[PDB]
Amino acid sequence: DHYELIVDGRVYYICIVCKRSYVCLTSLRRHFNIHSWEKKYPCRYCEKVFPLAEYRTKHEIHHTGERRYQCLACGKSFINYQFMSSHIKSVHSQDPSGDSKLYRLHPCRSLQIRQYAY
DNA sequence: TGCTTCCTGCCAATAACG
DNA sequence: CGTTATTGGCAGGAAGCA
Ligand SMILES: [Cl-]
Ligand SMILES: [Zn+2]
Ligand SMILES: [Zn+2]
Ligand SMILES: [Zn+2]
């Protein structure tokens, strides 16, 4: 399945197939489905099947059209982090990863994902 | 070069378990 | 049914297009 590598005390886990390295063992198994496809994640809405659960989920939010990421500076909503960040940097000349709260992530409602409590 | 999708550390939500 | 193991949502940078 894998093999460990230990440098300076820090432990790294290596995919036996593609030799990628992971700090987390959880990340390894998650990544490993790409090779082995033991679990499949089919889109509820079409063709595609994905080797990670979160890839499917992002794809499904695309079909529904829900816009969960909102700019606090002007109200515009976007489908994902990428579009939001892009808008905010170019229109407001600010970075959202930076010191402050520049956007709101609304709960998912156009389908049923895990619901964080904050 | 500007979307589009992928990637992984982190950990909360959820599930399995004795 | 507390308690341990698993899942996958999230950020935000990397990578993959044409
Ligand atoms: Cl919406
Ligand atoms: Zn691999
Ligand atoms: Zn689909
Ligand atoms: Zn704005």
Contact A16, A31 (CB under 8 A): no
Q: How remote is the CA of residue A80 from the centroid of ligand 3, in Å?
A: 16
Resolution in angstroms comes to 2.5
**How far apart are alpha carbons A75 and A65 in whole angstroms?**
17
HSE-CB for A93 with a 13 A CA cutoff: 0
**Which tokens go with A27?**
């990340």
Q: Say yes or no: Cβ of A32 under 7 A from any atom of strand B.
A: no
Residue nearest to nucleotide B2 (CA to C1'): A86
Protein residues placing their CB within 5 Å of the ion ligand 4 = A 71, 73-74, 76
CATH superfamily to which A69-105 belongs: Classic Zinc Finger (3.30.160.60)
